[PDB]
């Protein structure tokens, strides 16, 4: 069709050339309201009642490119019909500029400026504010029982689990049975249940809309292309089934259920760990080992297996260094996920 010019992905990564909004119905009945650079909406050719309003977003960062190509392709197949629709979904490609500049972020980590707390005027902060509208405008007259929000990212480094999900800690019930099943069909190797609030785009959706929201870190941060989508095969199929609302055709596989044990926010300057960079996510520790002191009070595995995640080095005295995690056994209680 004539809604794009080459690809939602590249027609969004094109600075000099501005893509204006333009709404167009497709042969199959799928209505595509394009809004602004990196923002495409889609509605079912019937729009029943039990339909879902999903927000699949990519590019919150800049390095993470694997989701974009997959998102980039899903679009292609929705216009060409190769891919059927069945759920009102907004395809966000926030912060394109950074993806072009090949960097993680312009000024500050965008996925940290979504809380109600005030922040300093920053490029990323401009975008955050914007996104919040999109969500406001999108979840209009809708019902939480049908709200989904999947933020797609990539691992800032290695990891024992190629890809894993990060459920937010919201005041509402945001860990449904259907949200689990999706993760399984995606064959996501691990799930991290956040223990406290945040300011990630995902968290924001759950906390202010009660939407089953996740942040999936699929594979690592390879250069646009390198990303071996081959590995993101289950995920790629899963999503398609998610928007097509039909036949979950391949076999799923339970994921290792984890629980944020505590955050390791840095506070002093004489900070140090027991590893370099070759430290993969989920690197478990026994009751006896310390992964690096802190000049004041040391640091060891409170539990037997307390694995670490997000081992940041650029950590500030205020930011959070890593994250602890303990393998927890789950269950359900009226369609919701609970532990112990």
Curated annotation (Swiss-Prot):
Reactions catalysed: N-succinyl-L-glutamate + H2O = L-glutamate + succinate
Cofactor needs: Zn(2+)
Q: What class of enzyme is it?
A: hydrolase
Active-site annotation = 217
NCBIfam families xref list: PRK05324.1
Question: What EC number(s) does its UniProt record assign?
Answer: 3.5.1.96
**Residues the record lists as binding Zn(2+):** 61, 64, 153
What's the family? Answer: Belongs to the AspA/AstE family. Succinylglutamate desuccinylase subfamily.
- The organism encoding this protein is Vibrio cholerae serotype O1 (strain ATCC 39315 / El Tor Inaba N16961)
Domain of life of the source:
Bacteria
Q: Which HAMAP family match?
A: Arg_catab_AstE (MF_00767)
One Pfam family matching this protein = AstE_AspA_cat
* Full protein name: Succinylglutamate desuccinylase
- Key words of the record: Arginine metabolism, Hydrolase, Metal-binding, Zinc
Q: Which GO terms describe its biological process?
A: arginine catabolic process to glutamate; arginine catabolic process to succinate
Q: Does the keyword Transferase apply?
A: no
The record's cofactor note says: Binds 1 zinc ion per subunit.
Which pathway, metabolic or otherwise, does it act in?
Amino-acid degradation; L-arginine degradation via AST pathway; L-glutamate and succinate from L-arginine: step 5/5
Question: What does this protein do, in the record's words?
Answer: Transforms N(2)-succinylglutamate into succinate and glutamate.
- Molecular-function GO term, any one: hydrolase activity, acting on ester bonds
What is the name of the gene encoding this protein?
astE
Signal peptide range in chain numbering: none
């Amino acid at each position: 069709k004539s809604l794009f010019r080459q690809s939602f992905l590249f027609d969004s990564l094109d600075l000099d050339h501005p893509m204006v909004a333009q709404t167009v119905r497709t042969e199959q009945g799928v209505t595509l309201k394009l809004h602004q650079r990196g923002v495409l909406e889609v509605i079912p050719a019937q729009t029943d009642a039990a339909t879902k309003n999903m927000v699949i977003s990519c590019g919150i960062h800049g390095d993470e490119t694997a989701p974009m190509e997959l998102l980039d392709k899903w679009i292609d197949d929705i216009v060409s019909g190769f891919q059927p629709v069945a759920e009102r979904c907004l395809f966000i490609m926030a912060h394109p500029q950074a993806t072009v500049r090949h960097v993680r972020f312009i000024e500050q980590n965008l996925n940290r400026l979504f809380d109600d707390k005030p922040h300093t005027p920053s490029t990323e902060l401009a975008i955050a504010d914007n996104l919040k509208v999109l969500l406001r405008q999108f979840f209009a007259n809708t019902d939480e029982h049908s709200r989904w929000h999947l933020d797609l990212h990539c691992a800032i480094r290695g990891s024992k689990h190629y890809s894993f999900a990060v459920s937010p800690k919201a005041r509402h019930p945001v860990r449904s049975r259907s949200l689990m099943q999706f993760i399984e069909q995606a064959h996501i190797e691990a799930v991290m249940l956040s223990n406290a609030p945040s300011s990630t785009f995902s968290w924001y959706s759950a906390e202010h809309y009660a939407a089953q929201a996740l942040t999936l870190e699929l594979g690592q941060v390879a250069r646009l292309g390198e990303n071996l989508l081959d590995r993101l095969l289950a995920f790629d199929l899963a999503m398609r089934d998610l928007i097509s609302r039909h036949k979950p055709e391949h076999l799923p596989r339970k994921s290792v259920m984890y629980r944020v044990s505590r955050t390791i926010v840095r506070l002093h300057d004489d900070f140090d760990f027991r590893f370099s960079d070759d430290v993969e996510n989920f690197t478990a520790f026994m009751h006896g080992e310390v992964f690096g002191h802190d000049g004041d009070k040391p640091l060891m595995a409170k539990n037997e297996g307390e694995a670490i995640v997000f081992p940041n080095r650029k950590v500030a005295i205020g930011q959070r260094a890593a994250l602890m995690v303990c393998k927890v056994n789950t269950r359900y209680e009226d369609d919701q996920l609970v532990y112990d």
